[PDB]
Amino acid sequence: KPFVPKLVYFEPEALSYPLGKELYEKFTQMGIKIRETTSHNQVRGIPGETELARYRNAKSTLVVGVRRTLKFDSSKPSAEYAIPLATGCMGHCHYCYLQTTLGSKPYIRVYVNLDDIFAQAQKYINERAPEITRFEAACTSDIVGIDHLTHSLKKAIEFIGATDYGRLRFVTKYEHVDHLLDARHNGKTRFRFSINSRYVINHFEPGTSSFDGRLAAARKVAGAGYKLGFVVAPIYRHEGWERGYFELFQELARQLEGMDLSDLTFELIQHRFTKPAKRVIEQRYPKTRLDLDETKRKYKWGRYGIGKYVYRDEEAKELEDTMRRYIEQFFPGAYVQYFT
Ligand SMILES: C[C@@]1(Cc2cn([C@H]3C[C@H](O)[C@@H](CO)O3)c(=O)[nH]c2=O)CN([C@H]2C[C@H](O)[C@@H](CO)O2)C(=O)NC1=O
Ligand SMILES: C[Se@@+](CC[C@H](N)C(=O)O)C[C@H]1O[C@@H](n2cnc3c(N)ncnc32)[C@H](O)[C@@H]1O
Ligand code: SF4
């Protein structure tokens, strides 16, 4: 069940890097169909005679390229910067914000020029030191879910672990963490899992690991000394959400029974969606029960980007207050980093 692509593209230039060569050798040996692409920013001939088909097939397609944009995006509130190791995901979460963010590039891209990327990360760390600089590695991908193929995240973990002022963090819905358990993280990596109510997981998170799988993985990473965290997102006011999210934290507490949870973090994100995201979702997941009724939402206008629908302030406050109380009840001492 670990992700393996059905189609792989290589940029010619990727072959000049160790990871490029390694991946080319691996995938040719596996007998996977391999193609050449002139830029990972434009891949041709992904199969499908319809949009939804090419979309589905794109999500089983890997592209091995070189990161040419070495300026890092901001990644608040998670981190100062997004470290670009991969883009895209094999998951099919109905609400996924990547459907607008990566609308046109739904294939999984991994970058092979780690030397360049880690060098630039160090430059950012240097520019702010002795202030701590955090990097988010899962801004635009499930980096953990694909990493068994590349070990790029493992390399990033060990790179950051060697710095004084750098810290790393990422979040996943995948359980395939075994190759990361012996990484020399040096306590500078927060390993997070996305969790949610039974309703949201069962109806909206196909193609991801089960809740039990995520928690089995969470026990493994805490066992290996990683700082642990959870991202409760998207917080979605389904019928019976109040008891739905109560049952989440109750089951969470039961699944972490007898563990050191002295440095446990929670991050809380309410469901959000853009106007372009709606009609996109409607034809990528035509039978979803996801509610995208804008009349049940308030519009938050954009600053540098486009705006989005979130819950009205009072309903958003109810969610925040309720999650905080459950976290206080079941995980005393645990730190809620933000609600948004
Ligand atoms: C995993 C994330 C990473 C992240 C992504 N992003 C970007 C990536 C993408 O371009 C966009 C999607 O709205 O959000 C961001 O600005 N800040 C982040 O912290 C996900 N997010 C989302 C939530 C919201 O859409 C946006 C800002 O809160 O980031 C978050 O707040 N916490 C995280 O830890
Ligand atoms: C883009 Se997700 C990338 C990392 C990894 N593949 C993962 O799924 O955890 C980052 C987080 O944001 C949430 N999230 C995704 N879409 C939305 C959304 N529309 N509203 C509100 N939240 C949304 C997801 O549940 C994740 O907790
Ligand atoms: S696992 Fe994360 S990035 Fe992948 S489809 Fe789901 S929400 Fe989107």
Dihedral angle over CA of 319, 253, 247, 194, nearest 10: 60
Which residues are CB-contacts of 230 (< 8 A; sequence separation ≥ 6)? 192, 193, 194, 195, 218, 252, 264, 265, 266, 267
Which residues are CB-contacts of 126 (< 8 A; sequence separation ≥ 6)? none
Distances (CA, A) of 142 to 115, 123, 139, 193: 21, 25, 8, 11
Resolution in A: 2.0
For atom 23 of ligand 2, the residue with the nearest CA is 234
Q: How far apart are CA 183 and CA 229, in angstroms?
A: 18
CA of 123 relative to ligand 2 center, distance in Å: 28
Ligand 3 surroundings by CB, under 6 angstroms: 89, 91-93, 96, 98, 142, 173, 208
Say which residue the tokens 């730190």 belong to. Answer: 335
Nearest ligand (C-alpha, residue 135): 1
- The one-letter amino acid code at 8 reads V
* Contact assessment for residue 137 and residue 109, using Cβ atoms and an 8 Å cutoff: no
> Solved by what technique?
X-ray
**Residues that constitute the known binding site for [4Fe-4S] cluster:** 89, 93, 96
Burial of 333 (0-12, 13-18, 19+ CB in 10 A): exposed
Nearest ligand (C-alpha, residue 102): 1
Breaks in the chain after residues (C–N exceeding 2.5 Å): none
Can the peptide bond before residue 332 be classed as cis, meaning omega within 30 degrees of 0?
no
Burial of 28 (0-12, 13-18, 19+ CB in 10 A): exposed
Q: How far apart are CA 264 and CA 330, in angstroms?
A: 12
Distances (CA, A) of 137 to 90, 308, 316, 324: 16, 24, 27, 26
Closest ligand 3 atom, residue 173 Cα: 1
Report the residue among 93, 134, 139 best suited for mutation to probe ligand 1: largest number of ligand atoms under 8 A from its CB.
Answer: 139
Which residues are CB-contacts of 123 (< 8 A; sequence separation ≥ 6)? none
Cα angle: 22, vertex 103, 20; to 5 degrees:
10
Distances (CA, A) of 249 to 1, 143, 270: 27, 25, 16
Q: How far apart are CA 108 and CA 146, in angstroms?
A: 9
Q: What domains are there in the chain, each with its CATH number? A: 1-113 (3.40.50.12110), 114-340 (3.80.30.30)
Structural element, H or E, at residue 171: strand 166-172
Q: How far apart are CA 152 and CA 220, in angstroms?
A: 20
Q: How far apart are CA 86 and CA 192, in angstroms?
A: 17
* Contact assessment for residue 233 and residue 339, using Cβ atoms and an 8 Å cutoff: no
